[PDB]
């Protein structure tokens, strides 16, 4: 978000790791992977993984 700004950076300051409000780490990883420009197929493949 500093070297390739796409969306606002306020959401990361609202949702911080020091607030203990990350009840769902999976959502944080999905939100971080959604910012990627990786092709959709690859995203589906990432969802296919079980571990």
């Amino acid at each position: 978000i500093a070297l390739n700004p796409l969306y606002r950076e306020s959401v990361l300051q609202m949702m911080q790791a020091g607030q203990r409000v990350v009840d769902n780490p999976i959502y944080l990883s999905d939100m971080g992977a959604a910012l990627t420009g990786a092709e959709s197929h690859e995203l589906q493949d990432v969802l296919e993984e079980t571990n």
Binding site: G18, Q19, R20, V21
Partner: peptide
Amino acid sequence: HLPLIAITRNPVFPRFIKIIEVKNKKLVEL
């Protein structure tokens, strides 16, 4: 003799200026 403040996930390291943003408004009265 005042009630404890609601730190609410905010560490204040010794000799380190820090900022606190509690969500409650009952602390604004105190």
